[PDB]
Amino acid sequence: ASRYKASTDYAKDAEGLTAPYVSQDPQETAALVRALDDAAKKGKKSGGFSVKKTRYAVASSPTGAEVDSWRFNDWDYKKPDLPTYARGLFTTRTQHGVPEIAVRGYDKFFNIDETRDTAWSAIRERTKGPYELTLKENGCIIFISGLEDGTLLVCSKHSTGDRSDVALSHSSAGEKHLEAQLERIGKTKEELARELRKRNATAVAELCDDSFEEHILAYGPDKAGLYLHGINLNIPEFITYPSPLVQKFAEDWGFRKTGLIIIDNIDDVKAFLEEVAETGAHDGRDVEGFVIRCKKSTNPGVGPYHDWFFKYKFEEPYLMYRQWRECTKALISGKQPKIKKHVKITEEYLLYARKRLAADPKLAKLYNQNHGIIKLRNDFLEYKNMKGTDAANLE
Ligand SMILES: [Mn+2]
C-alpha cells in the first residue's frame, strides 16, 4: 500500500484552513529570557540544564538591532520541564524596548526508537492523526523572520551574519538564495519581513545546493534553492503551520516546496514507511527520509495535544553512500579506508575511484571539501549499471 504519492499541489486546496496566530506576550517572553539567562550561568548549585547564549548583531538593520542565540546541550531535550524545547531560538529587543522572540525553530525531534516516545508502540498509543509525512530534504536549516524595524533576519541553526570562523556562513548563503528568489517573483525583502512579523512567525527552510555544501543527495543548479518545510509561531511553546499552508506560503514567496503525504491511520503510516525503506526511493526519486508531523499528549489522558514530530530515516542505500564518501575522503589523505559493511561492492568502488583520482589530482582535492561526491558515486553506479539500491543488497 505505497499508493500514496508525494505532492506539492496542496497549496491552493489549503483555501479552507486558517494559519495559527497568537501575539507575543512580553511578560512571558521576558520570563523565558530570565530562565535562559540563569541556565547560561556557570557557577550555580541548582537549575540542572545548560544553555549557551550568543548575542548576534544584525548587520542589515537600521535600528542597530541585536539578537541572542540560545543553544542547549543535546541531551537536555530528553529532560522534562525545559522552559522551551525549541532548537533554534533567537530573542531580541525592539527599538521601543519590548522583548520578543525573533526566531523559533521546531521542537527538537528524534528518530524512531532513539527515545521512548519514538517507539512504534508509543506513537500508536499517544499520538493522533491525520499524520503528515513530509519529505526530509537533505541540506542545512535556515530560519527567516521579520524584525520590528522591518529588517529581514536570516539565521542558520544557532548563527547569523558573517563569522571569522568560516569562509561563507550558512545564513549568508541562505540570505543570498532568498534575495534571488524574491526578485524572480517581483517581491522584496521588506515585504517578506513585513509579512513574517504580521504572522508572528519564523519561516523554516532547508538550504539544498551543491555549489555551497553538498550532502548525501545532489542539488544541482536545477534543484538548488530553499525548500520550505515549516512555519512556526514566535512563542515559547511549539505551534506550527499544517503543511498545505506551508506550500501556499512557498508559492507566494518563491520557495521550493516540501512534498507531503497525509495518512489517517498510524498503522498505515508504519506500513507505508517500512515499504519505502525497502528501496530508499519514492515516486522515482531517492529520499533520505520523512518527517512525520502529528499531535501528541504527554500521557494519553486528560490534558495536552501539542504538535509533535518524529523522523523516519532511510537506512540504505545511504549508509553505503556515507561509507563511499568517507572512504574516498580517507584515501585522499594518508589513511587506509575503513570498510565496515558492503565489503564486496565497496572495494569495487574504491578500485574505480583510485583510477579516476590518479588520472587528475584536481579531483583529489575537490573531494576534501566535497565536490564530486555524488558524481563519483553515480559515475560508478552506472559504470556497473546499478541503482544504488541494488548495490546495497549485493552483500
Ligand atoms: Mn539534515
UniProtKB/TrEMBL annotation:
The active site is at K136. Mn(2+) binds at K136, E206. Residues 85-319 form the T4 RNA ligase 1-like N-terminal domain. ATP binds at R87, K108, T134, L135, E137, K157, E206, H229, R293, K311, K313. It comes from the Eukaryota. AMP binds at L135, K136, E206, H229, R293, K313. Belongs to the TRL1 family. This is tRNA ligase. It comes from Chaetomium thermophilum (strain DSM 1495 / CBS 144.50 / IMI 039719) (Thermochaetoides thermophila).
